[PDB]
């Protein structure tokens, strides 16, 4: 009825990186959760550093 949008979004926010850093602080990020496709990007440590 009031039609007043409660989501005020600002384009100098990074909601994606705010969620990537939030999952690190609350849980073990190495684990794989398929439902949210929660599988963190991870290079091999012996390929980067020879």
């Amino acid at each position: 009825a009031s039609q007043l949008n409660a989501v005020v979004d600002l384009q100098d926010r990074n909601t994606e990186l705010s969620y990537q850093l939030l999952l690190d602080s609350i849980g073990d990020r190495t684990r794989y959760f398929s439902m949210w496709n929660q599988a963190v990007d991870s290079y091999d440590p012996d390929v980067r550093i020879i």
């Binding site: 705010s18 850093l21 602080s25 609350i26």
Partner: peptide, 28 residues
Amino acid sequence: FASLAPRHGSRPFMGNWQDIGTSNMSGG
């Protein structure tokens, strides 16, 4: 609100009082 709490024995298993809000930020 002891009727909402599980009973470990005959005492209500309550949480702590000051554990209600969050305070975490990106380094702070």
